Structure formats: C-alpha cells, structure tokens
Design a protein around this ligand. Sequence first.
Ligand SMILES: N=c1c2ncn([C@H]3O[C@H](COP(=O)(O)OP(=O)(O)OP(=O)(O)O)[C@H](O)[C@H]3O)c2ncn1[C@@H]1O[C@H](COP(=O)(O)O)[C@@H](O)[C@H]1O
Ligand SMILES: N=c1c2ncn([C@H]3O[C@H](COP(=O)(O)OP(=O)(O)OP(=O)(O)O)[C@H](O)[C@H]3O)c2ncn1[C@@H]1O[C@H](COP(=O)(O)O)[C@@H](O)[C@H]1O
Ligand SMILES: N=c1c2ncn([C@H]3O[C@H](COP(=O)(O)OP(=O)(O)OP(=O)(O)O)[C@H](O)[C@H]3O)c2ncn1[C@@H]1O[C@H](COP(=O)(O)O)[C@@H](O)[C@H]1O
Ligand SMILES: N=c1c2ncn([C@H]3O[C@H](COP(=O)(O)OP(=O)(O)OP(=O)(O)O)[C@H](O)[C@H]3O)c2ncn1[C@@H]1O[C@H](COP(=O)(O)O)[C@@H](O)[C@H]1O
Ligand SMILES: N=c1c2ncn([C@H]3O[C@H](COP(=O)(O)OP(=O)(O)OP(=O)(O)O)[C@H](O)[C@H]3O)c2ncn1[C@@H]1O[C@H](COP(=O)(O)O)[C@@H](O)[C@H]1O
Ligand SMILES: N=c1c2ncn([C@H]3O[C@H](COP(=O)(O)OP(=O)(O)OP(=O)(O)O)[C@H](O)[C@H]3O)c2ncn1[C@@H]1O[C@H](COP(=O)(O)O)[C@@H](O)[C@H]1O
Lengths: 288, 288, 288, 288, 288, 288
Amino acid sequence: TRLRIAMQKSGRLSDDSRELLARCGIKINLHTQRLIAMAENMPIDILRVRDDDIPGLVMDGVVDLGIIGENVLEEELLNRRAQGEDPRYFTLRRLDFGGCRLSLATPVDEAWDGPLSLNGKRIATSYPHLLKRYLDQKGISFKSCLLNGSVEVAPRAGLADAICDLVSTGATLEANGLREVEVIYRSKACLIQRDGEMEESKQQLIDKLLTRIQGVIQARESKYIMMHAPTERLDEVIALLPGAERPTILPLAMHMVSSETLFWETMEKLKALGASSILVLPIEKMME
Amino acid sequence: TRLRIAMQKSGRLSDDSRELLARCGIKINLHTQRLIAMAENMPIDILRVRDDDIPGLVMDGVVDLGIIGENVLEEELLNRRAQGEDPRYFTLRRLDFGGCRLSLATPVDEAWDGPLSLNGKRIATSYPHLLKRYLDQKGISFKSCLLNGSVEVAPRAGLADAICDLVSTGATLEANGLREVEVIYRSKACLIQRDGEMEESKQQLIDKLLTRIQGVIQARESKYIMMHAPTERLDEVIALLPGAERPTILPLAMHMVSSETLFWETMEKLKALGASSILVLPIEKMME
Amino acid sequence: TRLRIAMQKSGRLSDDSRELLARCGIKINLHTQRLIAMAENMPIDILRVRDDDIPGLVMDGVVDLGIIGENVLEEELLNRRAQGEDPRYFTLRRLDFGGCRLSLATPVDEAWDGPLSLNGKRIATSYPHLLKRYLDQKGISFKSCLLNGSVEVAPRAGLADAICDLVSTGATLEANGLREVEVIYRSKACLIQRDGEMEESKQQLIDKLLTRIQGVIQARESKYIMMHAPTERLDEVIALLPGAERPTILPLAMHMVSSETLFWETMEKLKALGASSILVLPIEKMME
Amino acid sequence: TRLRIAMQKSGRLSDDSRELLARCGIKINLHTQRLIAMAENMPIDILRVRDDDIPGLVMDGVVDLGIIGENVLEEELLNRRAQGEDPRYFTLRRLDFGGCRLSLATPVDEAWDGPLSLNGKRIATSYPHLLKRYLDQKGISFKSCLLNGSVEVAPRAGLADAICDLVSTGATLEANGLREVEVIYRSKACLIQRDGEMEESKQQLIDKLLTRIQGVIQARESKYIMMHAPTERLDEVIALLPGAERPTILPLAMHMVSSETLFWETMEKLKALGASSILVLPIEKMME
Amino acid sequence: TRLRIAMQKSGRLSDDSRELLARCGIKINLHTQRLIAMAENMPIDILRVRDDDIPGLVMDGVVDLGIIGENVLEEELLNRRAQGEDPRYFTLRRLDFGGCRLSLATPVDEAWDGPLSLNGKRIATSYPHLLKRYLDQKGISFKSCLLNGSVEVAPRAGLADAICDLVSTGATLEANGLREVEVIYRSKACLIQRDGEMEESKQQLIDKLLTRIQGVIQARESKYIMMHAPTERLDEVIALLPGAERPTILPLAMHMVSSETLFWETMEKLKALGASSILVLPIEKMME
Amino acid sequence: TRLRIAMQKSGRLSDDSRELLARCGIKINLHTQRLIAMAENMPIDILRVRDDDIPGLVMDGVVDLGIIGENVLEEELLNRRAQGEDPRYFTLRRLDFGGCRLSLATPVDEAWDGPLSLNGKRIATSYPHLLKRYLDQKGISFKSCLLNGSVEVAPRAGLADAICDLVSTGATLEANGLREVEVIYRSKACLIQRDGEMEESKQQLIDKLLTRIQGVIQARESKYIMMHAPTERLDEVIALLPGAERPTILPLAMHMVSSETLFWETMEKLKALGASSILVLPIEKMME
Ligand SMILES: N=c1c2ncn([C@H]3O[C@H](COP(=O)(O)OP(=O)(O)OP(=O)(O)O)[C@H](O)[C@H]3O)c2ncn1[C@@H]1O[C@H](COP(=O)(O)O)[C@@H](O)[C@H]1O
Ligand SMILES: N=c1c2ncn([C@H]3O[C@H](COP(=O)(O)OP(=O)(O)OP(=O)(O)O)[C@H](O)[C@H]3O)c2ncn1[C@@H]1O[C@H](COP(=O)(O)O)[C@@H](O)[C@H]1O
Ligand SMILES: N=c1c2ncn([C@H]3O[C@H](COP(=O)(O)OP(=O)(O)OP(=O)(O)O)[C@H](O)[C@H]3O)c2ncn1[C@@H]1O[C@H](COP(=O)(O)O)[C@@H](O)[C@H]1O
Ligand SMILES: N=c1c2ncn([C@H]3O[C@H](COP(=O)(O)OP(=O)(O)OP(=O)(O)O)[C@H](O)[C@H]3O)c2ncn1[C@@H]1O[C@H](COP(=O)(O)O)[C@@H](O)[C@H]1O
Ligand SMILES: N=c1c2ncn([C@H]3O[C@H](COP(=O)(O)OP(=O)(O)OP(=O)(O)O)[C@H](O)[C@H]3O)c2ncn1[C@@H]1O[C@H](COP(=O)(O)O)[C@@H](O)[C@H]1O
Ligand SMILES: N=c1c2ncn([C@H]3O[C@H](COP(=O)(O)OP(=O)(O)OP(=O)(O)O)[C@H](O)[C@H]3O)c2ncn1[C@@H]1O[C@H](COP(=O)(O)O)[C@@H](O)[C@H]1O
C-alpha cells in the first residue's frame, strides 16, 4: 500500500536509524508511544520493533525494508536454515553505524594458542549459530552453552571453558576475569529488502531513498582536502589519497574530496614526502 | 560448594531481589561489573544473570536457587515440555513482588464477546506457550504470531487480529488502538529450588533464609491494629480481621497483628459497625 | 454522569494530588499523555488541567471537584468579582499540602517601617488582587505593576519600589537585592465543590471520599504517644497534648493519639515536668 | 542609561536567545539566580523575564529591546487593542528560531470540511485573540472557551467542539482524540524595539548588534556549494540556486554561497540536469 | 555573638548533617550559593566549608561547633602535633553516620601474613598520619608514598608495594588488582566543640542541641518490641535485649524499647528459646 | 618501559584530556574503574590520578608526561621550592583548554584602590604560594589564611579581609558579598615532561604525539577565510589577518588559513575597509 520500513524501537541502533531517515528528509515523529508511524510527506510507514524481530519481519514479507545489525540478521538466518527453511532477503547495503564485534574470550590466567585449543571445550554464548558457523569452518568442535545475557559469568561460574560475546571497550571481560582472544565476526547495521516482486512505485521510492543514504554516508565519511602542490613529487601524493572524483591542481595547490579519512599516518606520509599546509574541511551534504 | 542463588542482573526484579536478600541480612555488593558475587558473611554466591536464563539455570542444576517471575518460569517450562524434556524444580514460595498480568487485548473499535470469538484468528505474543495453554484449556484454537517486543504493533500493522501481552498501567495499549479484554495469567516473582539431593549444610541454609523471607514479607504485609472494643458487638469485629495470632482485649480496647491490609471497605465496615479510633501502625521486622 | 475532579496536570500540587487520591484508594493511571482520566473502580474522572484553570472550572460547573491552592483560587474569585460576576463554590476542606506565602519584599539597603510606608509607591506582583485586598483593608493605596513571573526584577530594574511574591526558602529575593518584610497571605491546597444541586449518588461519593481524605491527613499529622505516668503531676501532662480521643492510663504509663506534632518545645516541657521514656510512633492509616 | 534587552528567563526561547547574543559577542553570565544581568564589555542589560511579559515590557518602554515569539507578541497586542489602547513597537526583524504553529484541531472520529463548519461552535484555546482574528477574517463566528493549558481536554471533556492550540510533533492531539486540521498562525521569535525617540548612542548599538544578528543567522542558513560546471547547460543551474553573491566559474567547476538550504529535491534537479560531485560545506561565521 | 557550626558544604557528610540539624528543629535554607547561613529561629550560623577545613576551623576557635569525620579530624590533629603544635578540642559525641574504614590493601596475587610483613615496604596513602600512627604502634616501619586520590594506582604503577585507603563496597580495589587485608581505622562523623571558655548563653544552646541530637539518634537506632511472655523461661529473654528502660509485662506479653537493633541472630535466639509473634515497630521521635 | 602519561581521573580537565589524546589517535578505554590504562595501538600508559598529584608525579619521575593546569603545577613547584627542594620539569607546551583565573576579591560595599591597600590585611586562599609570589613582587605584605574550598566564606565570616580565588562566571562571589578586583594569575592546562635523560624510542614518541597536539589545536583555532579582493586597498587586509601560510589571490577573491579567530571587531574593520562576502569555514584536521 505504502512503504514499510522496520526499525529498532529502542536501543543501540534506534538513534542512528532515526537520524539516517531524518537526514534523508523523512519527516516522522518517533517521540510517541505509537509503534507504527505514518510519514508526513513520503508514502512511508515506520514500524518500531524489537531488533530481534526485524530479520524475520523481512524474511517473512510482513514489511518491505529493515535496518538491522548483521549479526542479529545472520544469526536468525542461520537459525531458520537450521530448522530447514530457506528464508530469503536482499541486502541493499551495509550502513555506516552499529559497529560491533563478536569475540572468543577465555580466562585471563590461561595462555591462548589458537581456536584449535577449544576443540571439545564448552563455549557459552548468545550467538550459538554465528559461533557454530565459525568453529565449523575451522574444523573445531565444541559444546554450546547458551545464555541470553551476562554471558561473562559462564567461566567463573563453572558453566563454560570460554565465552563468545559482543565486545567494545573490553570493560566487562576484565571485570569478569576474561580477555578477548579472537574476533570471530564484525558487524554493522545494514539495510535489507524483502523478497519477491516489488511494485514499480515503491521500488522507485526504495531507489530514491537508497541514493539519499549513499549521499548521507558519503558526506560524513568523505572530506575536502587542501594541500600544497610540491610540483616535482606530485604523483606520490594522489596515491595515499584515493580520490575517485579526481584532484584539482592550481597555480599560486590541491583541492579534492577524499572518501576515506585522513588518518594521522596518511598525513605524516604526505608530510615527510614534502606537502604543506594540509587542510581537511567537513562536508555537510553531497550528491556526486 | 557454597549456595548459588541466581537473580536478574538488571530490570523489573533486580532491585526487589537485591532488597529481599539485604533484608535477610545478606551482605554482598552488587554495584560492580562482576556477575558472580561472593557473600561477605554467609557461604553464598549470587549469579547476576538474564531473567530469561534463570528457569533453565535452575532446571539444569547449574545453580541452587532462583528468584524469577512465574510467567518467564512457566513459559520456559512449557517450552521444554514441548521439546519433550521433563525439567524439574521445587517452588519454595511465591514472593511479594514483580506482579504483572498477561492479557488478551484487541482493537478498540471492536466489541468483544469472549475468548471463543478468537477461534481461528491470529494472535501476536511473546508468550506463545502461556497463551497456548490458556486457549487450549478453553478449547479455542488460533494461529500464533510471535514477537519479542513491541507486540502492540501487530494489529494496526496487519500482523494479527489480537495480541496477548504484559500490561500494567494500560498506557501502550491505548496509544496503540488496543484495550485489555481478558487477563489470562497473573504472575509474581517466586523463589525456586533446584531438583535432586540437596546437601544437609546448604539445605539448612536454604531453610534459614526461607524463614527470614517469610518474616520480611510478613512484616511488610502484616500490620498492628488498635481499635475500641464496642463491647456488645465484639464478634462481628474479629471476622473482617483475619488475625492468626489472636486479638488482645483490654479494659479502659483492641490490639492485634493483621496479615492482610486494612482496605478502606474493611475500615468502613468496622465504622458503621460501631468501632472507633481505629489505628494501623507499621511493623518494621517480625518473627512469629 | 460520573464524578469530575479537576487537578493540576503538572507542578507544585500534582504529585500531592495524585497521592491524596491514591491514598483514598482511587486507582487511576496518570502516566499518560491523556488529560481526562477514567477511574478503574470508582465512577470518577480526573481532568488534568492548569492550576490557573481550576477555580473557573469549578466556578463554572464544568467539573464537580477541584484541588487548587487558596491563593490561585481566591485571586480568580476576586478577579471575577472585580469584573462584576458573583462566582460561587463550596470549600469542602483545606488540605495538608501546597503550603506557601505571598509576601511584601523591598530592597535590602532600605529600612522598613510598616505597610503604611508603601502608600503611593509602585508594587510589582502576579497577585494584584490578593495584594489589593490586603492594602485596601490596611487603608494603604499604591500603584500596581503586574508581571507573571520574575517578579523580583522589578525594583532593581526601575519598574517598582517593592514586590509582592511567593516565597519559601527566600533564595531568589536575596539573589535579587530583596528581603521579605511582611507575609500578606498564607495558602494551602484545598478541595472545593461546584455550586448548585448535587445529585444524591455523586454526593454520596463526594461524602465517602471526603471521609477518606480526613483519614489520610489525620494519620500523617496525628501520632501515637507513649510516656511514663509520673503519677502525682498527671494533669499538667494531658494539657500540652490535645488528645481528642482521651489518654489511656496503665499500671506497671500512657498511650494516646495526638493530632498535632510533638514539637521539641512540647517534649522539653514534659521533660522538665517529670515525664520519661517519651515515644512517638508513626500511624500509617486511621479511621476514628 | 545603557541598553535594556528583555528575554525569556527560562523555556522554549531562552537557550536560543542566550546563544544569539553569545554569537554576537555579548559576554554575560546567565547562570545566576539574578534576573537583570549587566554585560561585561558592551553597555547592555539583560532582563530575564516571563515570555508573557515581554510584549508589554516593550510596548510600555520599560525596556528597549525584546526577543519574544510572534504569537505571544501579537496576542497581547490584539488584547490591548481590544481594551482600547494603541500599543506601539518596531519589529526589527524576524529571528531564525522558536518556530511553532497554532492550529485548529477537532475530534478524530469527525470529518472536516473547512472552517466554515465551525460557525457557532465552541472553541477552547489559550490564544483567543489570534483565533478570533482568524475566524473574523473568515467571516465565521464561534463561542470562545479559554484555558491556559491542557487545552486538549476540552472536546473529550464536553467543554468545546474543537480546540486551537500550539502544535509540533502532533503527539498530544492524538493522545487526546484530536487531529490537526488547519494551521491558523505560524510564529518565530523576533526582535522588537521600543517606541519613541531612541538616543544616538544606543541606537548605534542597536544597529551594530542587528548587523551581527543578520550575520549569525546568514551563516547558519547559508552554505558553500561546490559543483561541476556541465558547461553547455549552465544557466539552468544558477536558477535553482538563489545566489545573491554571484557564482564563481572555474576551468579544470563552481563555487558560491547559497542563502537557502540544498533540499534533496533541489539536489536531484541538478543531478538529472547533469551536475556532479555536488558538495555543501558549513559556514561558521560570515560578514557579507 | 551567636553559635557558629561548621559543616561540609557538599559531599559524603553534608546531607546527613543538613538532616541532623533539621531533625533538631533548626530551620535554615542550604539551597543557596551562600556559604554562611543565618538560622531563622535559633541564634545560629552554619558555615558551609570543606571537610578538610573543619578540624582546623575548630582547633583554631574560628567556629564553635563542627560536624566532621573522625579520620579527617584525627589526621589533621596528628599533622599539627607533628609540626609541634598542641591543637585542642572537645569531642561532644560520636554521630550515627559517615561510617567508613581505612584499610591496608595489597596485590591480589600475593598471600598476606600480617602487618609485620610490610616492614620496610612502600605504602601509598592519603592518610599518612593515621597509617603512621598504626604501624608505629605495631613496631613496623615503612616508606610513605602520598597521593590525594586514586591511591589504588600505586602498586600496579610501580609506586608502592601496598596502599592504605578508604574502603566500603570493595569495588575499586578489585578493579585495581587489590584486596582489603586489614582494617586499620574505622570512623564516623562526630560533633566537636571549640576549646576555651564558652559563654553561658551559647553553652546552654550547645547543651540543648546536644539533647536533641541524642534523641534523634536514639529514635532511629532504638525500637519498640512486642513479644509473647513464655512465662517460665522469662529471664533468658531480657538478656539478649539490652533494655535500659525496663520491660513491661502483661497478662493476656512484652513491650519495651530496645536501643540496639534486632539482628536476625538475636531474633532466632528468642525463637528457639520459645518466644512468639515477635514484633518490632519504628520509633519516629523520642525523649527519654 | 613504555610511555607514561598522567592525567586527571575526573574533573575540570579529564574530558579535555581524554579528547586531546583521542584526537591524536590514541585508542584507550577510560570508562573503567581501572586507573592505569594500557593503550591498544601505541606503547602508552595513562595513569588516571588526582590533578593535585600530577606536578609531583612528574617532578619525581614516577611518570613521563603530565597534562595539568598551570596554577596547580606552579603552586606545587613554589611549595617544594619553599621546603628547599629544586624540583625540575620541561614544559612541552601550553594547551588550548582548562582556562581559569585566580583573583583578588574583596567585600562589595568597599571601594578598591589597588593591591597596596591590602598591606597587612588577612587574605584567605587555596593558593597561598601563587598569592604570596604575587604580593611579594608587588612589595605588599599580608597575613595568609588558608582554606581548601569555600574560600568565599572568609570575609563575611570574620576570617579574612579579602580572598584570592578561582573565578569564571563570577556567580559565587556575588552570592557571597564579593566582587573580583584584580586577576593575579591566568592559567591553562599544559603538557609537561619529566626531567632526566629520555630514551631515544619514547622520545621519538613524545615528539610524534606533540606534533599531533599542535595539529589538533591549530585546526580548532585556525580557520579558512574567503573574501573579496577589493583590489586597490589590498595590503590593509592581510594586516588584520595574521596569515602565517600566505594569502591566495584569485581573479573572478581571497583564500587563507587564519590562526586566530575572526573576532567581530576584525570583521567590521574589513567591512568599513571595503571587503565583502566574508566567509569563515571550519577546519576539522590540519597538518601544515
Ligand atoms: N558490547 C555490546 C555491544 N556492542 C554493540 N552492540 C550491539 O547489539 C547488537 C548485536 O546484538 P543484537 O543486536 O543481536 O542484540 P539482541 O539479541 O537484539 O538484544 P536485545 O536488543 O534484543 O537485548 C548490535 O548490532 C549492536 O549495536 C552490543 N550489544 C551488547 N554488548 C554487550 O555489552 C557488553 C560488554 O561491553 P564492554 O564491556 O564495554 O566491552 C556485553 O556484555 C555485551 O553483551
Ligand atoms: N508492562 C510490562 C511489565 N509489567 C511487569 N513486567 C515484568 O517483566 C516480567 C514478565 O516478563 P519476563 O520477565 O518474561 O520478560 P523477559 O522475556 O525476560 O524480557 P527481558 O527482561 O529479557 O527483556 C516480569 O516478571 C515483570 O516484572 C513487565 N514487562 C514488560 N511490560 C511491558 O510494558 C508494556 C506496557 O506497559 P503499560 O503501557 O504501562 O501497561 C508492554 O508493552 C510490555 O511489554
Ligand atoms: N516560591 C514559589 C512557590 N511556593 C509555592 N508555590 C506555589 O505555586 C502556588 C501559588 O501560585 P499559583 O498556584 O497561583 O501559580 P500559577 O499562576 O498557576 O503559575 P503556573 O503554575 O500556572 O506557572 C501554589 O499554590 C504553590 O504550591 C510557589 N510558586 C512559585 N514560587 C516562586 O519561586 C520563587 C522563589 O522561591 P525561593 O527563592 O525559594 O523562596 C519565586 O520567585 C516564585 O515565584
Ligand atoms: N507544542 C507547543 C509549542 N511549540 C512551540 N512552543 C512555543 O511556546 C511559544 C508560543 O506560546 P507562548 O510563548 O505564548 O507561551 P506562554 O503563554 O508564554 O506560556 P508560558 O511560557 O508563559 O507557560 C513559543 O513562541 C514557542 O516556542 C510551544 N508551546 C507549547 N506547546 C505545547 O506542547 C503541546 C503539544 O506538543 P506536541 O504534542 O508535541 O505537538 C501542547 O499542548 C502545547 O501547548
Ligand atoms: N570509599 C570511600 C569513602 N567511604 C566514606 N568516605 C568518606 O570520606 C571521609 C573520610 O575521608 P575525608 O572525609 O578525610 O576526605 P577529604 O580529604 O576531605 O576529601 P575531599 O572531601 O576533601 O575530597 C569520610 O569521613 C567519609 O564519609 C569515603 N571517601 C572516599 N572513598 C573512596 O571511594 C573509593 C572506593 O570505594 P569502593 O570501591 O566502593 O570500596 C576510594 O577509592 C576512596 O577513596
Ligand atoms: N571557578 C572555578 C574554576 N575554574 C576553573 N577551575 C579549575 O580547577 C583548576 C585550578 O585549580 P586546581 O586544578 O589546582 O584544583 P585542585 O586543588 O586540584 O582541586 P581538586 O580537583 O583536587 O578538588 C583548573 O586548572 C581548572 O580547570 C576551577 N576550579 C574551581 N573553581 C571554583 O568555582 C568557584 C566559583 O565559580 P563562579 O562562581 O562560577 O565564578 C569557586 O569557588 C571556585 O573555587
């Protein structure tokens, strides 16, 4: 009828998802107890749902679009495949937020010599399927011990030999006698489309929105760079700076949009390569 | 080795569970990122875990004691029974907190004539097993639609004909075009014991702790009551006031501990029955 | 149709008004964006409105009951009387909360010799009518300068010679070069009834509710007192302790409910009058 | 003596007004209980007052400058005109903040066919004069029902047939069985000057400050734009981009300051018109 | 001139000190940026100062009364004694709040066999004098390493072999590879009087206030106890219950004020000694 | 072993210090109860300590680098010099944050005619050494009265004739009957290096980090400026705009990085000097 996008009502991803669509010029109020939100201008419905529920909402065709993190998505996918189904979706694109990593962590007072060493041990996790996929590929077998939270109790509680969990600061692990030891999966939010024939009108809108998304992400990653054309050694410049648009050379200088960040290392390289008054300006919005 | 109690790390029940054990004189710090907490005095470990994980922790024998709400507990129990297992636990006792009710709610603009009317409709819930038990008993069949949150989207989103959800204020339902319509399950926290032979020493401690629990709950429900012995009509008094301990009559008056509350209705009854200067004093701690 | 009580949606008085009715056993949810709240049990509607709007809501008969502070109430009353109307209401009773005082305050660096001295000066206030009533009675005339807030700018800003404002801690006045100097009106919340013939059924409910109110207030002001009957000098005791219910004397002692507080002065009087082990116990609920 | 600006002590507008003057380089501390604030550098006094009080403060000449929202301003103006006065002020300029709209809203379950349909109905509002002006112009008459808050009770409470209120998200209306239906007044903060001969010295300062204001607003609305001069179709570019300053064309490109925003529609137009690597950079401060 | 009491402006002790004097019926506003507060009724000044500054304020006679914790007090006392002075104060009384303990803590991975073992090691602390007093008495010498905060870095940073710090939950220590190992000083707030001849009038007030203090503390520690006189074994009761006031025996029972708490152990003792329906009621205020 | 930087665990400076090193690309988690933090990438330890403790940590060689405010640093330096030591450190550089000023303030109701007038008066402060240095240079003598906080009580309490304190808004002073009267010391955070031979490897890192620091500070102070080359009067432009990099002149215009801010005065000067469409763009990162 109109476009149905499903997003996390409340958590890690909901702020960034309200923002993405706001930056794509979607006027809708989310500060409301209401869970399906009609859009003001564009023919769009935002279902505010549990992150957990999004993969399935899309897999089942009950909504058209979903912003969900890869891990939650992939885990449910593997889950159903394991019940014997064949759930199907399109990944429109990987988003620029919701980063996190799933990791093997083990007791601190024990030396770690590779995943092999976990063969036949007991691993407590909330991601049994992501974990199983990983050790399977690696030929390692293990006994799963599932917990939906506080996974870091397992070892010190006699429940498991190691855990596999979401990490970022590393704080909890330490607090719990654990240390990261191998990242097994890195995830970000991504934008997925439902399976099956999608009507010309809402497809055109999916397509429109998508182009805004690329633009919003491009603008916040890309940057405007202004250096000093040390004329001779000029080729060795453009290399460290994957341009895509093409430099602009000036008599008096350089000016180009750089899709990656100027990491300090990359700046130092230009330095001791002979470039000067290097600048980097913010870009607020961009088409391209 | 020592007593293992499992409680909700963080949510609806964790404050009341920290408090119960505090009021039973269990010194342990919970303001710590650590998830298994050693007790200072008593030989006790508090595992701070996901509510979801507690029934199973107990069912599996991985801990000795669990404070968990009935619904979460019962739902997992029915779940495993449905996978064909026979998970076993003792209910030591139903606690005085964590009250909530699971309810059928349906769109506001539709008249409701009993659960029968749901036969063959689609009901969205997080408690498929509690719901299924209920309609099964009632001979009604239905198609389940499961969601782990924001269950109140279902109807207005075309996902279901009605939902079955946790309610208290009724706020969300309204916000979402729904109205409560039949409570199907009322729950409170309760205290459960693991199956199998329990060592004499920790049994003695379970037993000790339990007696404190009764005392803490008794003291906060029970009350000390002081009226005026309208001598003639004296029997019609003790009736509305289930005493258990026995009144105390005085020349000058009444004095007794009342296990229930003095609800206004009960006070008015004594009034127009001829009793005066009715008082009710708090009891802070009690044995009995 | 059913009972309409009007209370402050949000501010100084709304917490205490939610509490009063809660303590009278009125189950209704206020944590809702909804402004007219149906009651669960009792046939009652709570309109959640602006304090400012309550006197008029009652004066006009648009609701049946109102919890409003005296000053806001009285000021609007004087206001309409001044437009020539004759607005009419019943004061059911003065409540035990929302205390505050309206005061004359004047610059700190000026000595104050009575209200007389304000004759013909300019006074800035939000309560022009309460102020006018007061100086009128006192035969003093003055020029009003009205402001709906930040009334304490007036003097230091050249707008007035003194202000008349709500005070409690006295903080703002100081911050603004002012000092209290005469309280002209003390107010509390009170409970008012609409004018005109009130149906037998809702009157009976007004009457019921009222009795609960007296009880709730009595219980939180009154107290249970236990001393030592210094037998000889026994009359000089009951005096400082306005009993209302009558002492109870015991061989071994005293026991009675005291409607006022035991202020330290009153305790010291009993002390150096020869009484010992004086106690004061809380009363949680009372009929009487 | 020195410049007196009156601003909202606390609310919707005070943050933006502290910011405007801060961005104009007015050093003054507002984190103080004090309500008239002397400026450090510039000969300026900030009176921190009730928004309600600002129109009159200016209308009366008691201060020189006021930042106040249009609606509050206009309503008081109409108010006095209705008491027969002729209050006078200069609008220096409409500011870039404090946006909001006053709207007719009516019950959801009733179809709406224009303001005409309100003839002789009862409308509850806090803006009786703004409402009256509007229906008057439209030849519609109605009966006013005034409330200073919680205006959205009126209909569901039997007080009015419709309300006229400040709206933004639309949240409350829904919560209260209402829907927006016609905006009757859009407002922003604006900066007003007192009537009467204004001394050369403070006029020069009003004038100075004003120029800063234009600059601060310009910089946060205007933007720096960098495209690719698709040489042939070059005129069709500058059109969608009201420049004011004049484009800058470069051999290798475009560079100009655009006073409006690049709305997505405007970007898409340039796109399918043949422009590429469109950029938009922030401007922090500008003169011009 | 009038009574000068010095208390902690802001921290661990200021809430309890505002409360003590409030419960003694001292009306004074502390919610003010002002640091010397005049009392409304009683001829009293509250200086709101740094805890650190209180011992000296009293030692020097610059104020009359001080609420300060023992450790801060004692440490400064030892400090001056060590500079060769002879600072003098009266301890009026030890208060019922501000408890905390100073402790030796050492790395977790090292076994601890008494303070002796610290001879000649380096101990980091904020309480060098309290620490020095303690090891001196114990005949142990050591090298001090002083830090005013984050004392728990010392060991893991190579700064010291152990630390001596304020502990309560034990949280930080763990977080920092440390474990408590010996408490060397327990402190509470106390109330101290300045040295030298104290005028009859303010002495009388110190004396008055003091009596209120005892009463406030008594009431919150003491409790009202109601059991069942198991007639025969009646002496073995009063023992576990240090009465001070004397039991009261009744035909039908016991009733007395108990200055200590009914710890669970003490309740269990009465239980298996044959007492029943044990109650404990709060006491809000008491003289005695 | 690896680089040891000491920073304020918690206060005025810790946010800016977490940020500086974050902006220098130092990945380390500070949201941890742990006080010595290992760095992820770079061979670096962050000791999170008391600001008070930093000067000494560096002076003693116990750490290598310290971010500390000048006043705290200088005061401790003078302190030890006064105990007869000769503590030694290198100032690498003054940072762009933590600004504050120490000031003489005296009672409001007293006219101030220079520091001379303080000769032989009593001054209460937390910075006795900074104060003593200042009056010493000025040949004024005085009697110190030391307090570690709430220094603004001193005068109104009879403790001193004036105080010397940290000021910013000026709020407290007013609240306490005081007014600033002479700033005696302005401070910012700065970055200091430990004395003695610093190993080639960590020196190289100090050097690296330092260059990042200059860059981070440069980028947030410096700005990109775009005007209109009013060709004739072109020299009078570059003057008000200390360029350092050199302007860039364009046929059609100006473009340069300006290390200072464009203060309004400086913008107005260009204005009435004939420059137009002045812009100032943010710079996010820069080398140079
Ligand atoms: N560190 C994270 C963390 N980082 C990112 N996220 C994300 O949560 C996602 C991945 O898990 P899911 O979305 O599948 O979670 P879920 O099953 O829906 O859980 P609910 O939202 O339904 O509770 C994202 O896609 C994330 O944004 C995290 N979720 C949880 N944690 C945890 O926080 C912990 C420790 O953090 P540190 O101590 O700081 O390292 C852990 O114990 C964690 O479990
Ligand atoms: N109203 C409740 C509510 N009341 C009580 N509780 C409880 O949550 C419990 C029952 O669900 P579970 O414990 O099984 O929850 P769970 O599966 O562990 O969920 P997580 O804690 O793992 O997220 C308890 O035992 C409760 O204390 C509630 N949990 C959720 N809600 C919800 O809040 C909603 C609406 O409330 P009102 O609008 O105010 O009526 C809903 O939409 C709800 O889902
Ligand atoms: N001190 C009070 C204060 N004390 C009590 N109340 C009450 O506000 C009431 C009396 O004014 P109204 O109810 O008529 O107020 P109103 O016109 O409805 O104002 P709104 O709620 O509509 O904004 C009550 O009945 C109170 O509970 C107060 N309302 C305002 N103040 C003010 O707080 C100030 C200063 O307090 P101190 O510095 O701490 O003394 C002032 O400047 C005041 O105006
Ligand atoms: N939505 C608004 C709203 N939007 C903007 N403002 C503004 O308040 C102004 C217009 O009213 P006034 O300034 O005249 O208010 P006032 O009479 O001084 O009221 P006080 O500040 O004195 O309380 C501005 O100029 C605004 O910034 C608002 N003020 C109130 N509301 C209300 O918030 C409601 C609902 O919001 P939504 O549910 O999110 O749409 C309502 O019920 C409203 O009354
Ligand atoms: N645990 C405490 C603690 N407990 C009580 N207090 C008290 O602080 C007092 C004793 O130190 P002082 O008063 O001498 O402190 P001070 O020198 O004035 O310090 P400032 O107030 O001037 O900062 C009291 O008398 C207390 O109330 C504490 N002060 C500090 N801590 C610390 O909190 C830490 C760890 O707590 P846990 O991890 O929960 O055990 C430590 O690292 C501590 O330093
Ligand atoms: N105004 C300040 C203030 N401004 C900046 N800072 C800083 O605190 C520093 C200077 O003092 P120190 O660092 O030596 O402080 P310290 O001895 O370590 O004190 P602790 O952190 O150990 O408590 C910095 O270098 C600052 O960032 C301030 N510290 C305290 N104040 C005070 O806040 C007051 C009043 O502020 P206004 O009323 O707004 O002017 C005072 O009474 C002050 O004492």
